[PDB]
Each structure stands twice: as C-alpha cells, then as structure tokens.
C-alpha cells in the first residue's frame, strides 16, 4: 500500500486473496497517473471538451423568497450523460487503458453509472459489461436503452435480491476471473481500497469549481454545502476541497425511505451498525445476526445498504453531519424546483434539496449562504414521478 487504506477505522480491502494483486496494481497505476502530466492533460482535455466542465453554479431566485437563505446549485445535471458519474468514469477508463486492459465491468442501480461506462468505453475502444438488477431495470428503463444503444452488455441480475447490492456482488465474482484483461469500474466512493481514494480524486473538481465560483460571486465561502449520499462519490466530490475550511458545514443526506421508523429506509451511516462487506469496513444495514439487509428509496441511485468509508469517518470526528429525507419530502422538492426554477432534478439530488428547503423554512430569519450539489437531471425519473398521481 502506497496510500493508507483506512479512514480512522473504516476502510481496508476485505476481498478474496486472489483479487489482492489486482488492487495493488490499480493503486500503482493511480499513483503514477497522478504524477504524470500527460495523464492529467488527457484527463482535463476529456473533461472540458467532451463532458463539458466547468458546470455552472446557478443562484436560485424564487424558491428562497421570504427567507434570508441565499441558495446556489452546482449544476452536475449539465454534464454529458446527465450526472456527476461521468467525471470518475473518464479517469478510470484512461487508467484501464494505461494498464493495457480492454474490457470493463461495472454495476449500476439508477442506470447512470451504467450509461457513463457505456459512453466512456465507446469513446475509448474498451468492451463493456454491466450488471443491473431487476427493480432498477424497471424503475430506470430510460437508462437501460441509452446503455444498450452504445453497445454495452446489460447482464440483468436477479441472483437473489436483484438490486445494486446484488449487482455489486456479481461484478466482483466476474472480476475474480477476468482481472488480468478486465478492469472493474466500480460506481461509488466505496468498496476496497484504493477505490474510495481514486473515485474521490476523480470527482474532486466538483468541489474545487464550487469554491472558485462562490468566492467570485459572493466574495465568501458557503455556510454549508449539501449533497445526497447513496455510497458517497458526489458528496465526497463536493466536500473534498472544503474539508479544511472549518467554517463550511458539510451535510450529507441519506434516503429516509418510508421514514426511518418503518425500517424501509436506506440510511446506514446514521441507522446501521459497522460490518464488513463489499471489501470494506463501514456502517451497513444488517440483521442482528449479521445478514446484509436490503435498503429502500424511491430513487434507484441511493438504494445501497452501506456507505463509503471516508463518510463514516467524517461523521465520527464530527466534521460532517448526515441527515435523512423521506420519499415524500424528496418528491415535494422535485415538484418545487421544476415549478419555480425550471430545472428537473434527479430524485437522488432532490433529497439534498429537500434538506436545504427544510433549513430555510424552519428558520426564515437566519441569514445563510447554502450550495446544494444538483448531481443529476430527472429525465430518467419523469415516467416514475408521473405514476405517482
């Protein structure tokens, strides 16, 4: 290990011994790529001219009316593919071809990391197989065919519970065979080291563009930056450049589901027990005897029962607060952002927005500069939100 695998006590590499040379090879690839000027040059070029970075920072002018909250939105919804997922996927596919690899495996739940792997492969000449589970295929059929058209194989999981959890597993099983030709493009800032670090370094631009943008606009750093937390990449993408600016609060929002008390939620970091799964030690949702229990959210992209290790760590030292938002409060903030600002947010990003609206509504005379990370657009979600009538 050139880099440390642990964030306080969370982390590590709890993978079958056969995958261990694969992980240290990727860690070597990452470290040398990080120092290679031709890697960052190729990376930057692909972010600016193919993906469309920098994304905008929109001030809301109507939703905050009658309060003293100024609210900005970081526009990840305007990235090619329609979501933050693209940033990391470009960096890992250049790592994959730098390591002479030629197939790519990935897993997807909202379908959005599926589509971004499908597009980066077609761009770079890599072959791509994806695992996706049955209720997500259903909930996110838009993304199922975008993915298919770009020539990616959707291998439709229903080996047990058919969800992201199940896709994740199926993807690790396959890469336990394929690891010498194939690279595994894991979707979030979770799983075994160095994927928590690599996915964070490849999403870091989100938070460094926000810092530059707000300082030019407001002349001052936010009071809080808010982002939803499924496994943690967009949130750590956002939080990362601010961690040393103590003034700035970092709030991660987890799916509250039908409400925490129902048990049908997807909030491991504040309502789960630490466990060991998916190659890491991190809070998860498990039975009292330790079976991995499945989660719930109206949004497919936040339906994962564990969370990335750097988050479990930022909470324990109290640098970041994590909060929860029910299905209904996300749905209400989806409706309200359309109707007053003309932006249709992905239902995952609505969880972060519903928490910033709560903050503004509970204390209307509190002067506060907030930034929500609008991590995706809600085009995959419109069929689904319409069927809630």
């Amino acid at each position: 290990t050139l880099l440390n695998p642990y964030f306080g006590e969370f982390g590590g590499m709890y993978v079958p011994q056969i995958l261990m040379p694969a992980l240290n090879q990727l860690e070597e690839a990452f470290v040398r790529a990080q120092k290679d000027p031709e890697f960052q040059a190729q990376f930057a070029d692909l972010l600016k001219n193919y993906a469309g970075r920098p994304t905008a920072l929109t001030k809301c002018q109507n939703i905050t009316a009658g309060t003293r909250t100024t609210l900005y939105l970081k526009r990840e919804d305007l990235l090619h593919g329609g979501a933050h997922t693209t940033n990391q996927v470009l960096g890992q596919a250049l790592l994959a071809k730098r390591m002479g690899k030629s197939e790519i495996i990935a897993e997807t739940g909202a379908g959005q990391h599926g589509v971004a792997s499908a597009l980066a492969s077609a761009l770079l000449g890599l072959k791509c197989r994806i695992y996706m589970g049955a209720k997500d295929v259903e909930r996110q059929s838009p993304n199922v065919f975008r993915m298919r058209l770009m020539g990616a194989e959707v291998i439709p999981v229903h080996s047990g519970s058919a969800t992201l959890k199940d896709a994740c597993n199926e993807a690790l099983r396959d890469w336990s065979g394929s690891y010498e030709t194939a690279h595994y493009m894991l979707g979030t800032a979770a799983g075994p080291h160095p994927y928590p670090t690599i996915v964070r370094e490849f999403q870091r631009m989100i938070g460094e563009e926000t810092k530059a943008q707000i300082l030019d606009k407001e002349g001052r750093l936010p009071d809080a930056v808010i982002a939803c937390v499924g496994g943690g990449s967009n949130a750590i993408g956002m939080f990362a450049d601010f961690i040393n600016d103590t003034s700035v609060g970092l709030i991660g929002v987890e799916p509250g589901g039908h409400g925490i008390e129902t048990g049908e939620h997807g909030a491991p970091l504040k309502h789960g027990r630490v466990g060991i799964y998916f190659g890491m030690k991190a809070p998860m949702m498990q039975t009292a005897d330790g079976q991995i229990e499945e989660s719930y959210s109206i949004s497919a992209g936040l339906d994962f029962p564990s969370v990335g290790p750097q988050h479990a760590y930022l909470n324990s030292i109290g640098r970041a607060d994590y909060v929860s938002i029910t299905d209904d409060e996300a749905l209400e903030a989806f409706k309200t952002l359309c109707r007053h600002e003309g932006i249709i947010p992905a239902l995952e990003s609505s969880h972060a927005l519903a928490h910033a609206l709560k903050m503004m509504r509970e204390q209307p005379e509190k002067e506060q500069l907030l930034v929500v990370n609008l991590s995706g657009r809600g085009d995959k979600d419109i069929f689904t939100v319409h069927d809630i009538l």
């Binding site: 590590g12 590499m13 709890y14 993978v15 079958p16 011994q17 056969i18 261990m20 040379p21 080996s159 047990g160 959890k165 597993n169 690790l172 099983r173 336990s176 065979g177 690891y179 466990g275 060991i276 799964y277 190659g279 498990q286 005897d289 330790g290 079976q291 991995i292």
Partner: protein
Amino acid sequence: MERYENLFAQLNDRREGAFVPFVTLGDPGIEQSLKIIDTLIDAGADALELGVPFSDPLADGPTIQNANLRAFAAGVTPAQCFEMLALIREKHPTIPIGLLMYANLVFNNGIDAFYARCEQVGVDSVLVADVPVEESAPFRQAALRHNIAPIFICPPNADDDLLRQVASYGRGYTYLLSRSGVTGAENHHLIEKLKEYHAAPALQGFGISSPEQVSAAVRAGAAGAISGSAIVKIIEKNLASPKQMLAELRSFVSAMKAASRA
C-alpha cells in the same frame, strides 16, 4: 487445532490422500443436512468443510448460492448452525471440522466471541473467505487464542512474499487454489515452495471434479482434495428422492475417496 495433525499423520502411513467434502449447513433442512453429513463420513470423508449460510456469498457461484438460499428457506440461522455443529462433534469426536466463513458473520458480535463459540462447539479451523492475509491479524490472533486453526488461501497468482506469509500464519492445512473465479462444478511449483517454507498440508481448491484429479493432486504434492460443487448438485437433483440422494452421495464420496491414491 489438533485433529488435522493426526489425520495427515495417519493418512501419511496409509499412503492415502484426504477427501474433504464441502456442504452448507442447513441445506435443505436441519435434520436432513445432518443425515447428509453422517452419510458422507460413513462413506469415506476424511474431514469436513462446512459453510454457514451468508446472504452475500462474494466467492461463491451459483450452486452454493442456491444451497444458501435453501438453508435460508429452511430457517437455518447462525445459531442453529452452531447447534448442529455441537451435535456433529458429539457423535463424531475425531473427524476434523473446518468452517467456511464470510467476514461479517465472524465480526457481528465480536471476532473473539465468534472464535470462542467455535472452540466451545469443537470446531478445528475457520477459513474466512474474504479476509486476505494483509487484513487477517485480529482474526488470526483471536483463533490462536481459542485453539482454532486459521486457514488461508494460496491462489494461482501467488508470489514469494505471500507464500512465506501464509506459510507463517496458517495452521491445520493450506487451501491451495486451483483456478480463479467463484465456486462451481464447471470451469506443482507452488507446492514445493510451500514445503520449503514448511507450510501446512496443502489441500486443493476450486475445480476438483475428477476422481483422478484427486490422484493427480495427491502425487503432484497436495495432501488431499476438497469438493462441494458436485456434492451440492446431487442434493439439488435428488432432493425429491431423498434416499436416492443419500445413495448417490454415498456413491461419490466412496468413489472419490476410492480414487485418493497415486
């Protein structure tokens, strides 16, 4: 701890190889899993490798995944496994029992507490499928403290540093991987190096099918061969004809154990 030393030491004189079947505890029901393990023993199984049902078998392909699903329909919890394990030992006092585990099941109520009930029930070794040598320390230290043999995997793609580590850490036997992937009934140089480092009796891994494969493994340098895939398929097949299941089981174990010399 000890049961393994005797087995390999007495197998040595018999110039036999070990044949360890693998079975999921609970598949398809308690009573009937227990009759499968007595039929196995009585048919020639030298040691047992038993799996406790985990929901997310990362290293297990489909038969074993279905097998787990089966114990789970049968209602077999972690605690009813331990209850079966003390019953197996109570009537078969000598056969070495190794447990095939996943990490969360061990971590749940404390690593040390897990090794403690293992010792209390009379289990000999524990293999934790997803804890590599570099993360093993609290697991191997807790097992040594309760006289439980810490089993490690030595994969095809092994290098020296690893081979010396697993030789220094493991006890009981070494699981030597003969392929890559996840478990299924489809799909020499290392052994000498192990024996140079004075590692435990290497038994062979995934991808043992052939009766002659055991033979091969034995003369190639391996002290025995583990099989699960096969054993389980039969449990899946003849599940409607229980007596016939028992019978074909009694056949393969006899058949495979019969091939255990070369």
